[PDB]
Amino acid sequence: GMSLANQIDQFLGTIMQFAENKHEILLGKSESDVKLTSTQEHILMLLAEQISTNAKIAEKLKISPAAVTKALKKLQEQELIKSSRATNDERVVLWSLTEKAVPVAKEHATHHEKTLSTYQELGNKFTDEEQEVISKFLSALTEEFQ
Amino acid sequence: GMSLANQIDQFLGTIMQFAENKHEILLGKSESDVKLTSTQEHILMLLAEQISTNAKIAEKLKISPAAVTKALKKLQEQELIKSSRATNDERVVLWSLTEKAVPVAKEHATHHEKTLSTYQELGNKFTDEEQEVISKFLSALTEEFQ
Ligand SMILES: [Zn+2]
Numbered sequence A, B: 001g002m003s004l005a006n007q008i009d010q011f012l013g014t015i016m017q018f019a020e021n022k023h024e025i026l027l028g029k030s031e032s033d034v035k036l037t038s039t040q041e042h043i044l045m046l047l048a049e050q051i052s053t054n055a056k057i058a059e060k061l062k063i064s065p066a067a068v069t070k071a072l073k074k075l076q077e078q079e080l081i082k083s084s085r086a087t088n089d090e091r092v093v094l095w096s097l098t099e100k101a102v103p104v105a106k107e108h109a110t111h112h113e114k115t116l117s118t119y120q121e122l123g124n125k126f127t128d129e130e131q132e133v134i135s136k137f138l139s140a141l142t143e144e145f146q
């Protein structure tokens, strides 16, 4: 009392509320208009790190060529990325950020960093043995929502 | 590896996906069209148990008279509840289910029962000491989403 079952129920309620109208669960971020899909945001983060081919994007983000094609089309339309030709091979297209996209990618990277660091700091309050309990709990609970 | 931080991130992703387009996190329920708000569903559950006044509904569900008034209006329009006059006092209105609502309330009650029992069975796999760890974890994580 409160029972753990009820605590779990209430926790999931909290998460549902926070998640409403969002593409991703991210902390330290102000409410705003959803401009880009998560895949689009993640392509921009990848390109901030390395100019990349369609193939490399699919590989890194673990998504299909169709998904990559769709996201790139939208990003290019919004003038957030630009294509170029690989000097080694005339057939190979590379993608890079436009200046417009630089702060967009930086902002999204920051949101992920803040979110992960928040979870890390929380986890750091628990010993390995306790983290194992939490991990087993999360794994089991995850199975219920498949 | 996977780090607990990453496990938490992925877990919350799973929950976000499950929660999309839903009023409540409920298990053992098939996908369907959202006909009623959660408050409306909960009034029906309450009335299945006891014919009740507006005041009693607000008390039991811990919501305001305005919230109760709004939900009752919609339920009555859908012919899911009906008013009657308390025999003791001509001024006191009581609400009861219509036959139409009986299976609706039963179904929603079942969903809550299934959901809670699922969490209970999961919790039952952990000792009290382990449940305390989980509880502390959930409490702390909840604070991040306020
Ligand atoms: Zn993201």
Ligand SMILES: [Zn+2]
Pocket: B024, B038, B041, B042, B108, B112
């Ligand atoms: Zn409910």
